[PDB]
Structure 1
Amino acid sequence: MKTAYDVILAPVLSEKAYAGFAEGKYTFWVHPKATKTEIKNAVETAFKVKVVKVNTLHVRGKKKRLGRYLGKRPDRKKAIVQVAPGQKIEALEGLI
C-alpha cells in the first residue's frame, strides 16, 4: 500500500503546522523520494481527502547532530498538503 507508508508516514503537529492547517495545509513526515504527486496519493488513500497542493521540503533533526557523533543530519523530508475549500483532514484537526 503506497499510502501513508514509505511516502507520508505520520503527520507533524506544531505551531507553524497547526496555525498552518488553519488554511488546510498539512505538513507531513515522509521518505526522501515520495514524488510530490506520490504524496497526493498517500494522504488521498488514508485521509481520503482532496489534495489541492502538496509542498514538501527536506527536514533534518534540530541540531542535526545531538552531542558528539550520535545522529548527524539524517535524510528526512516534510510534506505540506493543502485541500480545496470545504474539505478538512480530521487526522490533524482532532490531533490536538
Structure 2
Amino acid sequence: SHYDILQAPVISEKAYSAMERGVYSFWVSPKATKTEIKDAIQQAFGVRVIGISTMNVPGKRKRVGRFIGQRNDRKKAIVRLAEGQSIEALAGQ
C-alpha cells in the first residue's frame, strides 16, 4: 500500500527552503520504482505530480570501541506538482 513506501520527509535548510518554491522532498524505500513513489505521494496527499527525481544514498558510522559501524542505506525523492497543487499543513513546516 501507498503509506509505507513513502518513508519520512527530508529536513534540511535545502529541502525546507525548497518547500517554498513548491518542491517537496522526502525519503522512501530504496526498492521503489519512480512511478510507484509518484503514485504513493499523489494518493497520500491528494495532489497531482508532474515531476520526480530519485537518488540512492548510503551512510556509515561506528559506535565507540570495537564495533565496526555501518549505518543503513536509503533513497530520496524530490517532487514538483502543478502550480496550485502545493501540499497541505504536513507541508506547513
TM-score, with length taken from structure 1: 0.79
| Distance in structure 2 (CA, Å) of the matches to 1:25 and 1:66 | 34
Runs (4 or more) in structure 1 with deviation over 2 Å come to none
Asked whether the 8 Å contact 1:13–1:92 carries over to 2, the reply is no
* Partner SS, residue 4 of structure 1: helix
Residue by residue, what CA displacement relative to the aligned partner does 1:41-94 show, whole Å, maximum 9, x if unpaired?
Answer: 111111111111111111233xx2244523x15220011111111110125421
Residue type at the aligned position of 2:68: Y
Q: Does 1:60 align with 2:58?
A: yes
Residue type at the aligned position of 2:19: F
Aligned length: 90
> Percent same amino acid at aligned positions?
53
* Partner SS, residue 26 of structure 1: strand
Q: Which has the larger radius of gyration?
A: 2
Asked whether the 8 Å contact 1:8–1:31 carries over to 2, the reply is yes
Q: How does 1:22-61 map to 2 (within 5 A)?
A: 22-61=20-59
Residue 10 of structure 1 is matched in structure 2 by 8
Change (3 A) 1:19 1:93: same
TM-score, with length taken from structure 2: 0.82
Gaps of 5+ in 2: none
Asked whether the 8 Å contact 1:27–1:78 carries over to 2, the reply is yes
